[PDB]
Amino acid sequence: GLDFHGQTVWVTGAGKGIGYATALAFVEAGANVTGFDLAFGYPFATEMLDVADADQVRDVCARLLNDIERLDVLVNAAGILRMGATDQLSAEDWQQTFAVNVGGAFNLFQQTMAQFRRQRGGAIVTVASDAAHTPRIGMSAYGASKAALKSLALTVGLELAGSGVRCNLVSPGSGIPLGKIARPQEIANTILFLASSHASHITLQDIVVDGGSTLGA
Amino acid sequence: GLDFHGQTVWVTGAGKGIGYATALAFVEAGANVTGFDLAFDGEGYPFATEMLDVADADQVRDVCARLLNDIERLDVLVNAAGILRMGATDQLSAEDWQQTFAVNVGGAFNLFQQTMAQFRRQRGGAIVTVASDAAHTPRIGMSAYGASKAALKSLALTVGLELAGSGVRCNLVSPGSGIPLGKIARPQEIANTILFLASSHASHITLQDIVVDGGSTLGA
Ligand SMILES: O=C(O)c1cccc(O)c1O
Ligand SMILES: O=C(O)c1cccc(O)c1O
Ligand SMILES: O=C(O)c1cccc(O)c1O
Ligand SMILES: [Cl-]
Ligand SMILES: [Cl-]
Ligand SMILES: [Cl-]
Numbered sequence: 001g002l003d004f005h006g007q008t009v010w011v012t013g014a015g016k017g018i019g020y021a022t023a024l025a026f027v028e029a030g031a032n033v034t035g036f037d038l039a040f041g042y043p044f045a046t047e048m049l050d051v052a053d054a055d056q057v058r059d060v061c062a063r064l065l066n067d068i069e070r071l072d073v074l075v076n077a078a079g080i081l082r083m084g085a086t087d088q089l090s091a092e093d094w095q096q097t098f099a100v101n102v103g104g105a106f107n108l109f110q111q112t113m114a115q116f117r118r119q120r121g122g123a124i125v126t127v128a129s130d131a132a133h134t135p136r137i138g139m140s141a142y143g144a145s146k147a148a149l150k151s152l153a154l155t156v157g158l159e160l161a162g163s164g165v166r167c168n169l170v171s172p173g174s175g176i177p178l179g180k181i182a183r184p185q186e187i188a189n190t191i192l193f194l195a196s197s198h199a200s201h202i203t204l205q206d207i208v209v210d211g212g213s214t215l216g217a
Numbered sequence: 218g219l220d221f222h223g224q225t226v227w228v229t230g231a232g233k234g235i236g237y238a239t240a241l242a243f244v245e246a247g248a249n250v251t252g253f254d255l256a257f258d259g260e261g262y263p264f265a266t267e268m269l270d271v272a273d274a275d276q277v278r279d280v281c282a283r284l285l286n287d288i289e290r291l292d293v294l295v296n297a298a299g300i301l302r303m304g305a306t307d308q309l310s311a312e313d314w315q316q317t318f319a320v321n322v323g324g325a326f327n328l329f330q331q332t333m334a335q336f337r338r339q340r341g342g343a344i345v346t347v348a349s350d351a352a353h354t355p356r357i358g359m360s361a362y363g364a365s366k367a368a369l370k371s372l373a374l375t376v377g378l379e380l381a382g383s384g385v386r387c388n389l390v391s392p393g394s395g396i397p398l399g400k401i402a403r404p405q406e407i408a409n410t411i412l413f414l415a416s417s418h419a420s421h422i423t424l425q426d427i428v429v430d431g432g433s434t435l436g437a
Contacts, residue, residue, distance in 0.1 A: 054311060086326070086376050087333040091274055094326060098318055102364065106306070106314060113307040132371065135424070140375035144322065144368040151352065151367035155360035156306050204355070 002192045005030030007072035009195075010064075012036045012051050012108065014044070018127055018172065019077035021184035022191050026073070029192060034064065037078070051078045051104030052096075061111035070119045073195045074112055076105040076126040076153070079146075081174065086140040094141055101145035102152060109156050121164040123195040126153040127187070128171045130210040133217045139174065146171075150206060157204050168194040169206040177211030219412045222247030224292035226415075227332075229271050229324060231264070232257045235347055235392065236297030238404035239411050240264050243293070246412060251284065254298070271298050271324035272316075281331035291335050293415045296325040296346040296373070299366075301394070306360040314361050321365035322372065329376050341384040343415045346373040347407070348391045350430040353437045359394065366391075370426060377424045388414040389426040397431030 009026045013019030014035025023035040023044050033044035040046045049060050065071070080100045082093035105126060116122055128150045131143035150169055157167025170190050173181055190207055193199055208214055226243045230236030231252025237259065240252045250264035257266050267284070269276040285291070300320045302313035325346060336342050348370045351363035370389055377387025392407050410429055413419055428434055 086372070086379055087330045089330075094323075098322070098368075102318070102368070103314070106361075110307045110309075113305075135371070135375035135378045137375065137378055140372055140379070141326075143375055144371040147371035148318075148322070148364040148368035151355070151364040152306070152360055155355035155357070155363055158355045158357055159306055159360070 002029050002196050002198070004073070004192070004195070007031045008068050008070055009033045009073040009075070010036065010071060011075040011077055012049070012104065013077035013079065013127070014046070015040050017077075018184045018187045019075070021188040022075055022077060025185075025188040025192050031073070036060075051107055052099040054103075054107045057107040057111055061108070065112075065115055070122065071112060071115050072122050074108065074122070074124045075191055075195070076108060076124070078104045079127065081142055083138045083142065085138065089141055097141045097145045098148070101142070102148040105149055105152060109152070113156070113160065116160050116165045117163045124153070124157070124160075124165065124167040125191045125194045126150070126167075126169045127191075128153075128169045128206065130171045130173050130208050130214050132171060133208060133214045136174070154204050161203065166199065166203040168199070168202060168204070170194065171206055171208040171210070173210030173213060176215070177213045179211050182209045182211065219246050219416050219418075221293070221412070221416070224248045225288050225290055226250045226293040226295070227253065227291060228295040228297055229253045229328060230298035230347075231266070232259060234297075235404045235407050236295070238408040239295050239297055242405070242408040242412055248293070253280075271327060272319040274323075274327045274330070277327040277331055281328070285331075285335055290339050290342070291332060292342055294328060294332055294342070294344045295411055295415070296328060296344070296369075298324040299347065301362055303358045303362065305358065309361055317361045317365045318368070321362070322368045325369055326372060329372070333376065333380065336380050336385045337383045344373070344377070344380075344385065344387040345411045345414045346370070346387075346389045347411070348373075348389045348426060349394055350391045350428050350434050351394050353391060353428060353434045356394065362394075374424050381423065386419065386423040388419070388422060388424070390414065391426055391428040391430070393430030393433060396435065397433045399431050402429050402431070
């Protein structure tokens with residue numbers, strides 16, 4: 001099974017959706033979970049955090065890293081979706097899309113990489129999107145932000161490979177597709193797999209969970 | 218050969234590097250070229266220059282609206298603006314992160330916002346965007362640069378899809394940053410590939426990205 005007993009697990013975007021399902025799944029698997037979100041009863045510890053807010057990420061992460069022994073798993077599951085034709089998208093939606101969808105994980109990585117290096121090992125799973133894999137009308141900015149996020153996460157994975165850290169992604173969707181859209185609980189199970197000891201030879205990979213809509217791209 | 222006589226061509230990043238070499242190559246091929254850049258500190262520009270920050274949406278809107286009032290057709294847009302700021306991910310400064318994305322993705326975004334209506338109205342034309350092989354494979358020291366170039370590529374491909382019904386071709390070149398094969402590619406050599414993709418000889422090529430780095434990505 002998927003067992004994370006005793007492990008310290010951080011999940012961003014934990015107030016709803018994929019991040020919430022993932023946090024709950026880690027709690028069920030025996031982990032000590034902290035969930036982070038803009039705002040929020042929860043069966044895990046909660047921290048308010050705007051992942052785009054670099055000063056808040058620094059303050060919150062520094063405080064928490066003082067009291068833990070290892071950060072066993074980091075899940076980046078924060079994100080926002082702002083759709084529109086490329087030439088109709090507002091300036092605010094462009095800036096916010098990148099600040100959250102790329103800057104968020106950037107800020108987390110800036111504050112956690114030294115911990116991964118000093119402890120050795122651990123796993124990072126980042127939630128991208130199948131829009132990072134194929135052009136999607138109406139999602140040029142969203143897709144582009146998720147493509148940046150994927151690229152960033154893979155280079156961070158290369159930077160941390162010498163420390164033994166495994167770094168992977170899941171790309172949810174937004175007779176093909178096959179079956180109903182994949183729900184947060186299904187995404188959460190894939191995240192736990194990639195975070196687990198059963199995936200110890202898997203790094204720099206990205207599993208698309210969208211019923212095949214990208215035709216393998 | 219590559220003939221652009223009578224065509225109106227816009228090139229960003231035209232003050233130096235690849236954008237300059239591309240603007241010069243289009244001038245030599247007969248085009249009427251306008252170059253855009255933050256600075257034109259070189260000693261020679263045989264094309265019209267517009268000095269502005271392509272990352273600034275308001276400046277791009279004002280300049281491009283004015284220029285589009287005076288031209289009948291925008292035959293080619295080349296997005297060649299870009300800055301390279303290197304560092305370990307957890308050492309990169311906030312300024313370097315912000316400016317990397319503002320220039321390397323925001324610049325092309327602003328140009329697309331101001332030119333897509335023109336491309337639709339005229340029913341054709343070509344766009345070429347300069348990405349990087351760092352968008353294709355992770356490169357230590359280049360996490361932000363590569364990520365910005367991956368966003369740029371994604372954006373350009375979706376714009377290409379949005380404009381495909383108007384007959385617009387939209388492609389990319391990804392320069393570098395017994396493999397690699399040959400010496401480092403000079404700006405003039407990258408410019409040649411851009412001219413090819415902008416040309417009628419590429420009329421059925423769209424949504425493609427030619428990596429020009431001596432094979433360093435091994436086909437990725
Ligand atoms: O329980 C699981 O879901 C599971 C998934 C992947 C691999 C495993 O070993 C598992 O137990
Ligand atoms: O002259 C060229 O560079 C050229 C390049 C691509 C295709 C052509 O036909 C050319 O003439
Ligand atoms: O562009 C490059 O970086 C490059 C490097 C080595 C060999 C090449 O041909 C190149 O184009
Ligand atoms: Cl979600
Ligand atoms: Cl606006
Ligand atoms: Cl001059």
